[PDB]
Amino acid sequence: VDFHGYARSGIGWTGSGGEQQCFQTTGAQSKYRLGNECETYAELKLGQEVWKEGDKSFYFDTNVAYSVAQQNDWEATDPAFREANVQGKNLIEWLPGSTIWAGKRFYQRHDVHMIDFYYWDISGPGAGLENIDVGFGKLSLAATRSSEAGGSSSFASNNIYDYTNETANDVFDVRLAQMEINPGGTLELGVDYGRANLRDNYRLVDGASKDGWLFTAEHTQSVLKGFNKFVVQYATDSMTSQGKGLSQGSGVAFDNEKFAYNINNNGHMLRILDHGAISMGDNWDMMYVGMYQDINWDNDNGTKWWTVGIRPMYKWTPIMSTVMEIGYDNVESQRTGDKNNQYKITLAQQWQAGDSIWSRPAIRVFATYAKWDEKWGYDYTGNADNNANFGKAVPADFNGGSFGRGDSDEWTFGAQMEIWW
Amino acid sequence: VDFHGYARSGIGWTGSGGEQQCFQTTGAQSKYRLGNECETYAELKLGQEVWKEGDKSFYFDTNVAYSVAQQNDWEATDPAFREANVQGKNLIEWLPGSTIWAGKRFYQRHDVHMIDFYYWDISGPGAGLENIDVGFGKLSLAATRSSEAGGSSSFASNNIYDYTNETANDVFDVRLAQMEINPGGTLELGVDYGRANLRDNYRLVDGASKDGWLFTAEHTQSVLKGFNKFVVQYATDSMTSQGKGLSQGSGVAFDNEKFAYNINNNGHMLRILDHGAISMGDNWDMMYVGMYQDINWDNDNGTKWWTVGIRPMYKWTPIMSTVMEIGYDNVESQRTGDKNNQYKITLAQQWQAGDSIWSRPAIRVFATYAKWDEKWGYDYTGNADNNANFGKAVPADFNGGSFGRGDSDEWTFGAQMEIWW
Amino acid sequence: VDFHGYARSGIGWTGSGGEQQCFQTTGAQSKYRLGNECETYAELKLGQEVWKEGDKSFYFDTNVAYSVAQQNDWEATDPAFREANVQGKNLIEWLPGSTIWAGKRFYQRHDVHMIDFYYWDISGPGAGLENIDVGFGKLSLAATRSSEAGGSSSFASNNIYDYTNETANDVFDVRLAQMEINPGGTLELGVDYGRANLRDNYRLVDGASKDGWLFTAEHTQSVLKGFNKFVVQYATDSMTSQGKGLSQGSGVAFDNEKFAYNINNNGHMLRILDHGAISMGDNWDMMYVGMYQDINWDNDNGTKWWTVGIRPMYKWTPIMSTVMEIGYDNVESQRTGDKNNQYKITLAQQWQAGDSIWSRPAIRVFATYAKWDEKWGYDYTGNADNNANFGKAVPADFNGGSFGRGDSDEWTFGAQMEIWW
């Protein structure tokens, strides 16, 4: 039994009073993590190599994930059961070093750690054949699934409230990885294709996106005792909404009161992303991100997002460091052309296992200052039946309402544990 | 710390579209399971030998069970807390070999693996004295509890809806096991007795069954590198409805909208079951089942079930095999005399941790075909207050409605992992 | 990976019929717990020392807790994510022997085992610095959080029902432990200060306690192969209601229908407690408790509690003992001056892992007798909206109702396990 995982927990305060506020720009899909995580998250993996004969082996792996509010000792919660898979390694005699796998799995996820952002991720129930040698790189193929909570009807209608039956979406990939291009630099290329999957006689809404494509190209360059990753992704239609490689094809979303409304995913997403971590001399490590994400949809409800962040670390002695994180977001509405923006400055003293920017457990004591200006938000006034602008981007002062977090600053402070193992 | 358990997970499709359909005959209590499990299910057990001195020890064991629908990554669910027991070996000097135990435990469950069917199983919160030597065999004695969600009233009434207080049931066993009866064959005999248990002044409905008996005789014969188990079980009254060891004595069941309704369970069950697994030379194995089950109740709502299945395995290499499963169900209604019937043909290719038909993990790729014809179903139209036929077996065409899955066929295909460790 | 925890589970009966009932005096905050636990409870901790260099290390710890009814095998439940923290030992250069920590944690909890009563407990989300050596003793410092489910309003109002927003409470610890004092004795002194913490513009109800103090002094004396603990605690205002070190500054509670009601906790608590465990020879051990707790509130709804209990254990042979527990509770109502009382006598035969009264795993077979006499209870008739006496102590016969459990007596029996590892 092999024990691995990730956990974060802590205690924080807000300068105006109360418990810790979390700062995320309205219309942005992520937040600069340092001193800006307001939840206790823990995911626990119990694995084992359960059989081995020479080079051939079977590995078993699980994951149970807990999310709680960090407000009380006794916090009851639904645990999320996220993995349960068997991996058969080097087991197909005419394909050396391949892994055959089936079950529920985190499958080759790619993230930007300082903003907590998975940019490519098709994790789920699935099966596949991974790490096929083609003599110049590695080829991996899987089939995986997600579902939309409704969006399908058992009869043809023009009323959206009939479309309440669950919609399975299947994703099929090809990943071609580890291609040597330049000395010290590698290329990874992926194509993910997704589609809604319907039982016979079942029907999606008219104009539903229904299927869609995602194309990923990543260059990874070894540099300065660390690396630079440069990522370009293009996606169409049913892959736009998630924007990570899981498909949503119905175009239907659900209210709290269980009314159904249209969110239609036709159009395209362009993502251009640079990130990495480097060491400068021996006393400084620095982690960084720059991203442009453009979502263009035929219903005009898309967003255009710029994110720029740097995280320099200074090392005083091997186990003790000072970390600063400076980030700036700009989010433009397609619908109105207005702009929401935020900058966050976090300064923290950190004790950690080993001397690296990546090495953890880490114990942090921090102070965060955040200044935002938001001039548009999403209309969620009333409910979907009541409101024709439900789920749509609108100005801050729209119709005498208040949308977005307006213009204000705030500052938070506290202490945090973070570990992976 | 000792890590043991069971898990199954996968991904599948249906030939007419959508996610994997699961095929079970209306009125049958089990399903032929190769390529016909649609659930991600895992049981995770953490044990330890906490104290050991000489021949004596205290073993501690737990079980946490997760069931999710295998449609997304983030699947939140209630975990079922199924075990937490302490087992004390050789602590009674004058009963050597014996185990005393108390707490929540899976106590000596007996199943047929290819249909996922427990035929003897009194598992629950309990306590007992296990594996006493009587010189010619082994004797084990326990007491366990189950409950029924209502069925008890605190006052004298003739109204069914007043019987909403929970009904505790006590189960007490005598298991006399491992007796040599012929060369290479052993006999096990069981008597399980159970009753409803009421708080003072409380009561069940007039004509409630209240208490009941289960009598089990099992012969285990070693043949052809495996075994044949031949099982005869007779049960009466409160034991009939649950059908495998736990008393249900109230006779009252509950609607979705929380209307109580009288089912009753007076009468008898006869189960005759033959099953096992054998090896037919080096390259061939087979597991097999034949079962007759007769449930006869004074309210006419019983069922008469015939089921028969075979599962040949062919070995190509020590770790790669082809599995065929052929199963047939026929279920006759006591109430109408009509018959529901289904046959299933599944062909699968699998990779497995060693040569044996019992070797796990196994990673499968499968294709399943199922043909059914159903002429009776259970009436669940409306609710118990507005429908007098609620929970009763009715013809397929009853009132011009549709009951049971009619006359149809379908096929499914996919990939699956099955593991115990 | 290190696997540790606590668990208890069993099966029992009541002499008048049914499952096992649990006996606790109306207005008492604990129950004499040998043969008087009706819950399957398990806490499962997975720890690991994940980095070690010289004296220094980082230790990671977890706790997930399950509490289920012990009525069936399949008991679904919300697990409580109680704890998840990292502890950095010997990291700080000029504070040798000190530990820094952050996350959800069980922090310095002191209990009386025979009544299951934590008398000092500030556990929760937090962070701290502990075991700072000051040469004559050790200093420990922490900050932890607890949160009330409502009690805060975002606008100015005199309406109690407008106070529905959560109220964060922050607790600040100073513990000075391990003082030399006398041959074979030692002393710990603690001061905990707690306060409600509000988001800007928000408010609590008029006259709400808002902040408060706990003052703890504990002397521990080594005596007769075991120990005595003598505890004096005094608390004021917001610390009184929880009574163990977590402030509740709102003064607001909620009924099932979600009507807010005022339970104001201004005033003071005095607790005097004596407990311990000793060996009176080779074959005789005993555990004991005596306590006086007086809660005096300005709304007259406090309670005045006397309790005393002894638990002698006779050892026949090293693994088998006979345990008796005799306890007496008396609770006086501040509001009425009436008295509720109970005496419980439990006799049990125990097998346990070793020859100490603290040795567990333990398997117990028991019989418990209890008589109670109750002259007052709490009014929970109707809702907080329609009953002006809601949540308040009233005579047993109030308006011809029945409040408290009257005069009665009963006996329970069965078997249970209790383990820690």
Q: What DSSP letter does each residue of C224-243 carry, written as one string?
A: TTEEEEEEEEEEEGGGTTT-
Touching subunits of A (3+ CB pairs, under 8 Å) are: B, C
- Using a CB–CB cutoff of 8 Å, tell me whether A172 touches chain C: no
Rounded to the nearest angstrom, the minimum Cα separation between B211 and chain A is 37
- The secondary structure of residue C388, as a DSSP letter, is T
How many Cα neighbours within 13 Å face the side chain of C225? 13
Residue reference for tokens 């549709």: B402
**Structure method:** cryo-EM
Q: Is C336 on the interface with A (CB under 8 A)?
A: no
State the Cα–Cα distance between residues B345 and B421, nearest whole angstrom. 28
Write the secondary structure of C317-379 as one string of H (helix), E (strand) and C (coil): ECCEEEEEEEEEEEEEECCCCCEEEEEEEEEEEEEECCCCCCCCCEEEEEEEEEEEECCEEEC
Q: How far apart are the first and last CA of chain C?
A: 14
For residue C395, cis peptide bond before it (omega within 30 degrees of 0): no
> Are C376 and C26 contacting, i.e. CB atoms less than 8 angstroms apart?
yes
Say if the Cβ atoms of A102 and B77 lie within 8 Å.
no
Any CB–CB contact under 8 A between A416 and chain B? Answer: no
Nearest to C79 among A70, A79, A419 (CB): A79
In this complex, which of A40, A72, A353 lies closest to C84 when CB atoms are compared? A40
Whether B63 contacts chain A with CB within 8 A: no
CB < 8 Å to A361, chain C: 50-51, 58, 60, 86, 88
And the tokens for A112? 């930007």
- Distance of residue C78 Cα from the nearest chain A Cα, in angstroms: 5
Q: Does B195 touch chain C (CB under 8 A)?
A: no
The C-alpha angle with vertex B272 and arms to B269 and B276, in degrees rounded to 5, equals 140
Task: In whole angstroms, give the CA distance from residue A229 to residue C134.
Answer: 50
Report yes or no: A68 and A39 within 8 Å, Cβ to Cβ: yes
Quick check: A17 and C199 CB within 8 A? yes
In this structure, are residues B50 and C419 in contact, taking their beta carbons and an 8 Å threshold? yes
Residues 261-320 (A) with a CB less than 8 A from some CB of C: 319-320
End-to-end CA distance of chain A: 14
Quick check: C40 and B84 CB within 8 A? Answer: yes
Q: Do A102 and B363 touch (CB under 8 A)?
A: yes
Which amino acid makes up residue A70?
Answer: Q
Unique residue bearing structure tokens 């589609």? A195
Instruction: Give the number of residues written for chain A.
Output: 421
Q: Which residue from A46, A91, A143 is facing B351, i.e. has the nearest CB? A: A91
3-state DSSP assignment of residue B325:
strand
Is the CB of B126 inside 8 Å of chain C's CB atoms?
yes
Closest Cα of chain C to A116: distance in Å?
20
Our measurement of the distance from residue A215's CA atom to the centroid of its chain's CA atoms, rounded to an integer in Å, reads 17
**Distance, CA of A111 to CA of A114 (rounded, Å):** 9
CA distance A245 to A253: 19
**Most A CBs within 10 Å, among C81, C89, C250, to test the A interface:** C81
Residues whose CB falls within 8 Å of the CB of residue A171, separated by 6 or more in sequence, listed in order:
A122, A124, A143, A144, A145, A146, A192, A193, A194, A245, A246, A247
**φ and ψ at residue A274, rounded to 5 degrees:** -125, 135
Which sign, positive or negative, has the C-alpha torsion A116, A118, A124, A128? negative
User: Do residues C289 and C271 make contact, with C-beta atoms less than 8 angstroms apart?
Assistant: no
Best residue of A1, A50, A58 to probe chain B, by most B CBs closer than 10 Å: A58
Q: Angle at the Cα of A142 (from A141 to A146), degrees rounded to 5?
A: 150
User: What is the rounded CA–CA span in Å between residue C220 and residue C214?
Assistant: 19
Nearest alpha carbon to residue B416 among A104, A174, A146: A104
8 Å CB contact of C3 and B46: yes
Which of B1, B79, B198 lies at the smallest CB-CB distance from C3?
Answer: B1
d(CA B251, CA B263): 5
Radius of gyration of chain C (CA): 23
User: Is A40 in Cβ contact with C81 (below 8 Å)?
Assistant: yes
Backbone phi, psi, residue A239, to 5°: -95, -5
Count of CB atoms within 10 A of residue B339's CB?
16
Q: How far is CA C300 from the centre of its chain?
A: 24
Rounded Cα distance, A418 and C180, in Å? 38
Contact between chains at B17 and A197 (C-beta distance less than 8 A): yes
Smallest CA–CA distance, residue B104 to chain C, in Å, is 6
Give how far A24 is from chain B: nearest CA, Å: 22
**Nearest CA distance, B76 vs chain A (angstrom):** 4
* B265 φ/ψ sector (left φ>0, alpha ψ -120 to 50, else beta): alpha
User: What residue in A sits closest to C195 (Cα-Cα)?
Assistant: A18
Instruction: Report the chain A residue with the minimal C-alpha distance to residue C107.
Output: A73
d(CA C328, CA B225): 64
Could you give phi then psi for residue A225, rounded to 5 degrees?
Answer: 65, 15
Task: Give the count of beta carbons closer than 10 Å to the beta carbon of residue B358.
Answer: 14
Query: Nearest residue of B to residue C4 by CA position?
Result: B1
- Which among B366, B69, B22, B67 is positioned nearest to A168, based on CA atoms? B69
Contact check, Cβ <8 Å, A18/C197: yes
Q: How many CB pairs under 8 A join A and B?
A: 134
The number of angstroms, rounded, from the C-alpha of A283 to the middle of its chain's C-alpha atoms is 31
Phi/psi of residue C230, each to 5°? -120, 120
Measured in angstroms, the resolution is 3.0
For residue B361, say if its preceding peptide bond is cis, omega within 30 degrees of 0: yes
Residue B323: both structure tokens together:
């599995």
> Taking a C-beta distance cutoff of 8 angstroms, is the pair B78, C76 a contact?
yes
**SS3 at position A190:** strand
